[PDB]
């Protein structure tokens, strides 16, 4: 029973800020609020009903109004759950280099960067682990 | 605030109260949790303490 509240885009982590606190001052059956970068206009609200929402966003700034119906917590869980790679992995680049495939030489657990040694052509090539897919595993 | 590298909870000191943890400034997203025990949202990611919580954290 979680639901969707159309905000200003840009402001969802500062509304998300004030309804927890308003749900706990004025004791609505609030339980979770989500606020993700992927989600942008969206804040998402579990709650115990429409109208606990409904009273939640009363007189809020920047917030647009509720969406129709409820969310279900399956559509929800890729947000709530998100590399692991080793050196002598083969990997796809898939961000100049599209679709090249290539070795891993360092991996940067730190910078969150893996070094890559193309199997085409001459040098070493840097790039954030979300850029690249793993297609062998050694 | 920042986010503790390993539990993601949201706080300004340099260690986490949850776990003396270091945390980072470099975070993403955001998730509240005002009740535990009635959150299903809350049980699918595994958070057992009430906070604010980052949705990703780097150094
Ligand atoms: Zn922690």
Known sequence: ?138 | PRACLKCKYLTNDEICPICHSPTSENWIGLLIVINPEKSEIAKKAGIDIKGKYALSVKE
Do not use: C, W
């Open chain 1, 1 to 138: 029973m979680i639901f969707a509240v159309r905000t200003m885009v840009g402001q969802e982590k500062n509304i998300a800020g004030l309804m927890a606190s308003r749900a706990e001052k004025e004791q609505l059956d609030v339980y979770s609020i989500l606020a993700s970068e992927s989600l942008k206009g969206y804040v998402l609200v579990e709650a115990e009903t429409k109208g606990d929402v409904e009273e939640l966003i009363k007189g809020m700034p920047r917030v647009r109004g509720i969406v129709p119906g409820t969310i279900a917590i399956e559509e929800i869980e890729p947000l709530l759950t998100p590399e692991n790679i080793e050196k002598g992995d083969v990997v796809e680049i898939i961000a100049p280099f599209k679709g090249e495939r290539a070795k891993v030489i360092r991996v940067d657990k730190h910078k969150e960067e893996v070094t890559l040694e193309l199997e085409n052509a001459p040098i070493p090539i840097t790039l954030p682990v979300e850029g690249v897919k793993i297609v062998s595993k050694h």
